[PDB]
Amino acid sequence: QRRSRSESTIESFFARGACVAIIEVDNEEPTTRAQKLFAMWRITYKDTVQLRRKLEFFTYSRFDMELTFVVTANFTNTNNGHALNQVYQIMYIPPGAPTPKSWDDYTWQTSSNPSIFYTYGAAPARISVPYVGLANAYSHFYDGFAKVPLKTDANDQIGDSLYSAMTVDDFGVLAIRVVNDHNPTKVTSKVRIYMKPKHVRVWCPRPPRAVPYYGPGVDYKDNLNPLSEKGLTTY
Amino acid sequence: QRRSRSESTIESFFARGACVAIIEVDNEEPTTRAQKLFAMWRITYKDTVQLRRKLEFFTYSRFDMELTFVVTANFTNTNNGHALNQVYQIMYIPPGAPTPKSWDDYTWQTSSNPSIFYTYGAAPARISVPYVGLANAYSHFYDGFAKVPLKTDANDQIGDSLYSAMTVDDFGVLAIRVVNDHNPTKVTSKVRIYMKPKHVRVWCPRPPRAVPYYGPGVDYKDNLNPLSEKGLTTY
Amino acid sequence: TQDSFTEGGYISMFYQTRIVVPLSTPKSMSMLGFVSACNDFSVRLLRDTTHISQSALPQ
Amino acid sequence: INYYKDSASNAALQLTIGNSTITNSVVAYGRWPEFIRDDEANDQPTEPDVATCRFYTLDTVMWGKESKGWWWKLPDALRDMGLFGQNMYYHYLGRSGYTVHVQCNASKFHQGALGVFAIPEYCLAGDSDKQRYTSYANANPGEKGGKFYSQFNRDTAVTSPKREFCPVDYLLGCGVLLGNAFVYPHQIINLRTNNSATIVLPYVNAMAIDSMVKHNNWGIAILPLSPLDFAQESSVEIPITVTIAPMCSEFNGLRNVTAPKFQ
Amino acid sequence: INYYKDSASNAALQLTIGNSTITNSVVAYGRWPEFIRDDEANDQPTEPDVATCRFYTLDTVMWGKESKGWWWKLPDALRDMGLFGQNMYYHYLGRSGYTVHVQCNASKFHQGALGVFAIPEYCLAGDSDKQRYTSYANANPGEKGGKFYSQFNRDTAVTSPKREFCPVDYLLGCGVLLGNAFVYPHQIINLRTNNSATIVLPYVNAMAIDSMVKHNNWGIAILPLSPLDFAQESSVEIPITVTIAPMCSEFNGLRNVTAPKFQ
Amino acid sequence: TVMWGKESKGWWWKLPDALRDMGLFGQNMYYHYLGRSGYTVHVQCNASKFHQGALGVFAIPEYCLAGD
Amino acid sequence: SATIVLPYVNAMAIDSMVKHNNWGIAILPLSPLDFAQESSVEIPITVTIAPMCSEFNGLRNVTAPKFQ
Ligand SMILES: CCO/N=C/c1ccc(OCC[C@@H](C)CCN2CCN(c3ccncc3)C2=O)cc1
Numbered sequence A, B: 001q002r003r004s005r006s007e008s009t010i011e012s013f014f015a016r017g018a019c020v021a022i023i024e025v026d027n028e029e030p031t032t033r034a035q036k037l038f039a040m041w042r043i044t045y046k047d048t049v050q051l052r053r054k055l056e057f058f059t060y061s062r063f064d065m066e067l068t069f070v071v072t073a074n075f076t077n078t079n080n081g082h083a084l085n086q087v088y089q090i091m092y093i094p095p096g097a098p099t100p101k102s103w104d105d106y107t108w109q110t111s112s113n114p115s116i117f118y119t120y121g122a123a124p125a126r127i128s129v130p131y132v133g134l135a136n137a138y139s140h141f142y143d144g145f146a147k148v149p150l151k152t153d154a155n156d157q158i159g160d161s162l163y164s165a166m167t168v169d170d171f172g173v174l175a176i177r178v179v180n181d182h183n184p185t186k187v188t189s190k191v192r193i194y195m196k197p198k199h200v201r202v203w204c205p206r207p208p209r210a211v212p213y214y215g216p217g218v219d220y221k222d223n224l225n226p227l228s229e230k231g232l233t234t235y
Numbered sequence C: 001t002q003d004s005f006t007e008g009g010y011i012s013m014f015y016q017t018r019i020v021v022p023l024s025t026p027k028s029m030s031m032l033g034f035v036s037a038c039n040d041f042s043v044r045l046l047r048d049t050t051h052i053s054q055s056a057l058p059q
Numbered sequence D, E: 001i002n003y004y005k006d007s008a009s010n011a012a013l014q015l016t017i018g019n020s021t022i023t024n025s026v027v028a029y030g031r032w033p034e035f036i037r038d039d040e041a042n043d044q045p046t047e048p049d050v051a052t053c054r055f056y057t058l059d060t061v062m063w064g065k066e067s068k069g070w071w072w073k074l075p076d077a078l079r080d081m082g083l084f085g086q087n088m089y090y091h092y093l094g095r096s097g098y099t100v101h102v103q104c105n106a107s108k109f110h111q112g113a114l115g116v117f118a119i120p121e122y123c124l125a126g127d128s129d130k131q132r133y134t135s136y137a138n139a140n141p142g143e144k145g146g147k148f149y150s151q152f153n154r155d156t157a158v159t160s161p162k163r164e165f166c167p168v169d170y171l172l173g174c175g176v177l178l179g180n181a182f183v184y185p186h187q188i189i190n191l192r193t194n195n196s197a198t199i200v201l202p203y204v205n206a207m208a209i210d211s212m213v214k215h216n217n218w219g220i221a222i223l224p225l226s227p228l229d230f231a232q233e234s235s236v237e238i239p240i241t242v243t244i245a246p247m248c249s250e251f252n253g254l255r256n257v258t259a260p261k262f263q
Numbered sequence F: 001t002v003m004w005g006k007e008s009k010g011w012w013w014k015l016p017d018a019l020r021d022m023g024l025f026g027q028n029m030y031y032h033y034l035g036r037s038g039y040t041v042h043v044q045c046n047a048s049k050f051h052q053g054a055l056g057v058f059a060i061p062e063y064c065l066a067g068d
Numbered sequence G: 001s002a003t004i005v006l007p008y009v010n011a012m013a014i015d016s017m018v019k020h021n022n023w024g025i026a027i028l029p030l031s032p033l034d035f036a037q038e039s040s041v042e043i044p045i046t047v048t049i050a051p052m053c054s055e056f057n058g059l060r061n062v063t064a065p066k067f068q
């Protein structure tokens, strides 16, 4: 036979689970000072760089998503007894929905918002999501603004907006809490989120990133000397 | 193609599990004073507000139900040893059936009443129930009384009844206990109940609630200024 | 939700000629407004509302 | 494939009625009143044809600048109207539809607007901290009806509580904004265009037939959407009249007469 | 066998245009500009035929030994070109393709090479520690365009930051090596072979039609791949000219005129 | 809008002169050497039943006026 | 209210719009305005115009007439 290009397809190139978020949640006795009883994470893939760099090969994309959650817990001390198995609640809050202000407020009723209840020690949680883009395709790069200043504006701040930003709040957030009450001993936990694109279509290929990322945009600050030395007539 | 209304259907609108009850049960050495060894909860959806508000969009409804139970346990102290995995018993008591007076009385034999035995650390429990309404549809709103006073009544209390109430005891109760004997260390636990309507039909739409609920009825006490200020000729 | 990237537009009203009344007639009047959706209206992505809240569970 | 046996386990002009005549109409939910069908019942019903299906006129009310609204309950308002009330009190079970006609006439120099709403299972709020403590007598005023208020006046009596409703105009007396009340069957009387309103209400309930004494099936609410005015006069008052005609009425469960204690 | 209902759960020469004439071409992605089809829309569009689809010539620039490059944004560069700009500012939604012609003439004793690149969604980097802080005015220079630099000059102002781009020639102003810029649609002008370049750009965007004021669809970058030289002269300068013709332009959403504040 | 009273004597306008600064019509008028168009004219004036009066509206081709 | 529809009238099929006006509109009070027995009466009059079937030719730089 002859060599094939089965593994160079777009689907195969993105058929891997890539970490996109590490989130910390703690269980302990509530106190006046700041605590990590519940956490909120803004959904995106730009926190990490590997999946971001792989996706930025193209200007436009359209795909469904698969999310997997891995939870790891540990103690902090030894003289405050032990704890029983904990249950974690993960809730998806789309834009416009109320956001929690405490680990036990009414917002956790999740009457309409989807939620996942995970029991520690079981298999990592998993879900799937379809394409939820307002337009016909996701826009990795956007060359424009959300507002245009006008001569008749009273002040310059009316039309001021960040460059290369479509919407301030996009795709909602994920809120993670520990449903169990506090044991006499504090327990810390980390949730790792892994993302896998599926049914992927792409448009307008672009050259890959060559210098370290700096912010959500295309800005560069340091390490602008990627290539190394080599002789002109040296093999 | 053209935009569809798949997600605006009645079934989709109610295709979510909503919390309706948080119940506390404790395991410890029995004593003369009051304790929480076993608990009884009266079945209803008016304890919470999100599902209540969603359902009150219509005057009449007819649906089956799906119930899910999530259990979370914890310790209270550290110097009284530990405990082994516990088993929880949940029993449905319809109207007219005997009710328990202790955590270990004969009523728990559940010869005819259905019961669920749940082992801690397993998947959340789940069951389904059909439409069990005496009439042809559930009545969210009832404008009437259960008794009518008469001129020939000896006293005024014979015909006195609460307004907008059909039956005092409706749909029975749920009794939750810990089957295990008491360990030297107290263990607390909370059971959260989530309800999902299925095969839903509705009649007579009504405007939604605009002020905070106050009691099982339509009474309002405080926070009667919902709308905010805005200029007449201000965009 | 409020967002400049999905702004819809503006609605305004003005007088064309004016209100004219005869004698022995009220010079002030009231107007009412209504809104509705057409048959080509669709929604997506069910989510919870911010118009209802709760502070304490029934005891 | 479904495994369990139970389905629940499965994964998801002149109008003349009887001897009465009145000289466009609105049909609630597009359903005309009709009698019970043979495929739904629970004895021989009693079905008066003309002795009860006719127009009865209630007491006239007065609309001025400070009026806030009025409300009535059906079939409560007709409990003392000819043989209809006698049949209502002589039978355990009753059923009926209604035709409601609201009359209010003015001149071309007047201005105003009335909104009439028919509400199924119209439940009103109380006037005390206690919940669902309203009395039967206060909840069934009769043909006189009740009135709305612009503010919530909590009852301060502790010895002899009034046990009465305290409806609020802008909350429709039930905690919902008035602007959405148009979701219910409704009519608008604008003095510059028309002078009357008509509505037809079929029988609506979770049961085919139910008692008429302890349960009211319909509520009628009339509110001034725009204040009344006339030329430049300080005070203006005009009459408003209501007429109601039962339609397709059935009764069952004959026995001795019921005598409720109204105060 | 698929169990879940949702699919997501499933496991994976002379060219004449209008009244203008210019005397091989490159078509981007092998797609000619075209109008919107009936199977994709969101009112009656306005589609000028000859009043806007014609060649407009920008300001000439000068290329010397120390020149590093130039860049322009479309449709920004044509905001003040005849009726095209008026239609752009009088409508909420716009769409169009482009034809770009670059002219540069020299003698047989000159030498050099220019690379012209058309980039969709061409985003440039800032000149400050703050991220995405560039201003609208600085990001839309107009027909004058901008220039590239050989080094990153961080802005030291703290009171009145400039809020301007700082493109780098060998990074293409976006953090990618220039050598790979040929992945985009491109042309090469070599003085020993040719003296002009032509490119045709269709409308590219995630939406069928979008606003032209707050979003730029295309970017044009011209860079000297080889330095300019002539005989043994110390200083050499030659002119470079750019002409752009809109093609198949549509507008929708007529209303009062927009007046952006450019400084 | 204009105002009509007891001492008003009349008003006149010229077309296409009156529309020289109306949206893109004026821009096309000033960007082209030759132009052509028809017109639809609508005159609005509302009063009560107790008012009285009469207005005459005339469309005149090649309407030339006298000097002073 | 009043409505009129005016077609294009001229000795030539197409002509310049800047130096030549094709139509004139004249509004005159045939009868004086009055109301009850009031001494002074004023009411508004409004005019709306819609171009129809407009053609342009001869594209070139923009004309800027000097109006005062
Ligand atoms: C019960 C909890 O389960 N709910 C989970 C869930 C997960 C993901 C959901 O969608 C989040 C958005 C994703 C489809 C990925 C969004 N992408 C695609 C394009 N994009 C992006 C980001 C920054 N710049 C350009 C594009 C993104 O970040 C919705 C719900």
Ligand SMILES: CCO/N=C/c1ccc(OCC[C@@H](C)CCN2CCN(c3ccncc3)C2=O)cc1
Binding pocket: B043, B044, B045, B046, B065, B067, B090, B091, B092, B114, B115, B116, B127, B129, B130, B132, B138, B139, B140, B141, B171
């Ligand atoms: C072994 C334990 O499993 N048994 C569980 C079980 C669960 C639910 C059961 O039915 C309880 C009644 C439900 C069908 C919901 C009753 N609803 C519907 C109408 N409604 C209501 C409440 C207040 N005002 C109006 C209507 C309700 O509260 C019966 C047994």
Ligand SMILES: N[C@@H](CCC(=O)N[C@@H](CS)C(=O)NCC(=O)O)C(=O)O
Binding pocket: A103, A104, A105, A106, A107, A108, A109, B022, B192, C054, C055, C056, C057
């Ligand atoms: N923080 C309160 C209890 C909070 C509570 O019960 N909140 C209700 C509504 S106000 C709820 O929805 N809780 C969700 C949950 O935490 O499971 C307390 O213990 O004093």
